């Protein structure tokens, strides 16, 4: 089982960036993909989830307008777009298949 | 939101020592707690599910326990690879929340 | 006396919600005041955490209750006063609970997810 994420992701302020998470070694459609943010030198925040089967999502109120979650069942790859980026500095984002298995992380600068 | 209070935020210990980290739940979370380990490369791995159940492949020196609203992770005999970061996470209620983390450092 | 026999349909005797006393002023041949025979789905007598039942006189009989654990029967003896200092109760060791594994192990939930209309569990 592998959640293989994207990035380095260098982006200009006011732009949007789309980070991927290609799943393998299991049936994509049967599990949830959860996304978590880590602001360096600090803890982990839960962003929200997606159910690839339905396309149903739930977000953390904090991240509601910021993050947008998407899955492409044809490629078994999940995405997260961040929007209107400003003085966020850098943060590392992780997707995880219902917490037992996590992806390696993607740094957005 | 359930607040998970992780203590100590940092701990110095030596090889072969037994250590415990704690997460106190602001509301009852039953047995719904995970213990996560983060490597210096950033890789996150789950060590314990449902408070006390060890994941496949995890060395038996790792154990999870509960007493009142205190959920503990215990490493019975520290190895050099264990001096990393640890995080608890509650999945008992809708906003999933994490402890603040514990960095385990060599004495 | 109270006799439950060939009651294939019953899983519990809890429907006798208010039953607190069996006097045993009359008994089934063999001096039984409570008799349970060949009840293929019986898994519960009463919930002995809540229910109290007293049996003044007579013995217990349990045979061919495959889904009924001996712990439930032993709890009943305790509750009812069919006390082990006194005389016997023809209780089979081999034909009560033989088709039941009683509670034994614990499965724990590794994952829980709510939606307004759905619940996903592991």
Domain spans, chain A: 1-109
Compute φ and ψ for C88, nearest 5 degrees: -60, 180
Q: Judge whether B91 is closer than 8 Å to chain A, CB to CB.
A: yes
| Pick from A43, A92, A96: CB nearest B42 | A92
- What is the per-residue DSSP string for C3-59? EEES-TT-S-STTSTT--EE--SS-BTTTEEEEEE--TT---SS-TTT---EE-S-E
Separation CA C109–CA B50 (nearest Å): 6
Number of domains in chain B: 1
Separation CA C71–CA C53 (nearest Å): 16
User: Which DSSP category does C110 fall into?
Assistant: S
Interface of B with A in 37-76 (CB under 8 A): 41-46, 49, 55
CATH code (residue B75): 2.60.40.10
By C-alpha distance, which of C105, C33, C39 is closest to C76? C33
Contact A34 B96 (CB under 8 A): yes
- ∠A88-A90-A94 over CA atoms, to 5°? 105
Q: How far is CA B77 from CA A105, B20, B71, C13, C107, in A?
A: 29, 11, 19, 53, 28
Output the CATH code of domain A1-109.
2.60.40.10
Q: For the stretch C43-68, what's the b/e string if a residue is b when 16 or more beta carbons lie within 10 angstroms of its beta carbon?
A: bebbebeebebebeebbbbbbbbbbb
- What is the per-residue DSSP string for A51-71? ETTTTEEEE-GGGTTTEEEEE
Per the structure block, which two tokens stand in for C50?
């809540």
Q: Which residue of A has its CA nearest to B1?
A: A60
Which domain does B33 fall in, by range? 1-107
Residue B61 CB coordination number (10 Å): 13
Per the structure block, which two tokens stand in for C71?
């712990």
By C-alpha distance, which of A71, A46, A51, A76 is closest to A61? A46
Can you name the residues that pair with B10 across neighbouring β-strands?
Answer: B103
CB-CB contact of C2 with C27 (8 Å): no
Separation CA A17–CA A31 (nearest Å): 25
Contact C122 A98 (CB under 8 A): yes
User: Beta B44-49 vs B53-54: how paired, if at all?
Assistant: antiparallel
Contact A49 C110 (CB under 8 A): no
By C-alpha distance, which of A20, A39, A42, A36 is closest to A90? A39
Compute φ and ψ for A104, nearest 5 degrees: -75, -20
Q: Which residue of A has its CA nearest to B86?
A: A43
Per the structure block, which two tokens stand in for C87?
């005389």
How far off is chain B from C111, nearest CA to CA, in Å? 7
Q: What is the 3-state secondary structure (H, E, C) of B66-84?
A: EECCEEEEEECCCCHHHCC
Contact B45 A102 (CB under 8 A): yes
CB-CB contact of B107 with B50 (8 Å): no
Separation CA B46–CA C6 (nearest Å): 52
By C-alpha distance, which of B80, B87, B102 is closest to B17? B80
Separation CA C25–CA C56 (nearest Å): 8
Contact C120 A51 (CB under 8 A): yes
From chain B, the residues in CB contact with A58 under 8 A are 94
CB neighbour list of residue B46: distance below 8 Å, 6 or more residues apart: A99, A100, A101, A102, B34, B35, B36, B37, B55
Q: Using DSSP, how many helices (H) and how many strands (E) does chain B show? A: 0, 11
Q: How far is CA B90 from CA B27, B59, B96, in A?
A: 10, 22, 6
Separation CA A16–CA A13 (nearest Å): 8
Separation CA A33–CA A47 (nearest Å): 11
Residues in chain C: 122
Q: What is the resolution of this structure in A?
A: 4.4
Burial environment of residue B90 by CB neighbours within 10 A (0 to 12, 13 to 18, 19 or more): buried
**Count of CB pairs separated by less than 8 Å, A with C:** 13
From chain B, the residues in CB contact with A8 under 8 A are none
């Amino acid at each position: 089982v592998q959640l293989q994420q994207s990035g380095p992701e260098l982006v200009k302020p006011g732009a949007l960036v789309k980070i991927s998470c290609k799943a393998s070694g299991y049936t994509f459609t049967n599990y949830d993909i959860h996304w978590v943010k880590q602001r360096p030198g600090q803890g982990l925040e839960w962003i929200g989830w997606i159910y690839p089967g339905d396309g149903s999502t739930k977000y953390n109120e904090k991240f509601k307008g910021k993050a947008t979650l998407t899955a492409d069942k044809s490629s078994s790859t999940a995405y997260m777009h961040l929007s209107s980026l400003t003085s966020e500095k850098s943060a590392v984002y992780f997707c995880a298949r219902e917490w037992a298995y996590w992806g390696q992380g993607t740094l957005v600068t | 939101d359930i607040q998970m209070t992780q203590s100590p935020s940092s701990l110095s210990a030596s090889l072969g020592e037994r250590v415990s980290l704690t997460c106190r739940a602001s509301q009852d979370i039953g047995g719904n707690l995970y213990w996560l380990q983060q490597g210096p490369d950033g890789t996150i791995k789950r060590l314990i599910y449902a408070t006390s159940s060890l994941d496949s492949g995890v060395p038996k020196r790792f154990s999870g326990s509960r007493s009142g609203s205190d959920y503990s992770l215990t490493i019975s005999s520290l190895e050099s690879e264990d001096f990393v970061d640890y995080y608890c996470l509650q999945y008992s209620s809708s906003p999933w929340t994490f402890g603040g983390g514990t960095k385990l450092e060599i004495k | 006396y109270l006799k439950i026999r060939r009651s294939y349909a019953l899983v519990s005797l809890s429907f006798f919600r208010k039953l607190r006393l069996i006097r045993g002023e009359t008994l089934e041949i063999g001096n039984y005041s409570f008799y349970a025979l060949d009840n293929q789905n019986l898994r519960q007598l009463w919930d002995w955490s809540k229910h109290n039942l007293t049996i003044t006189q007579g013995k217990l009989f349990f045979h061919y209750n495959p889904k009924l654990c001996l712990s439930e029967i032993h709890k009943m003896e305790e509750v009812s006063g069919t006390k082990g200092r006194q005389e016997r109760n023809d209780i089979a060791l081999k034909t009560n609970g033989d088709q039941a594994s009683c509670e034994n192990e614990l499965l724990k939930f590794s994952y829980i997810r709510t939606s307004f209309d759905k619940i996903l569990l592991r």
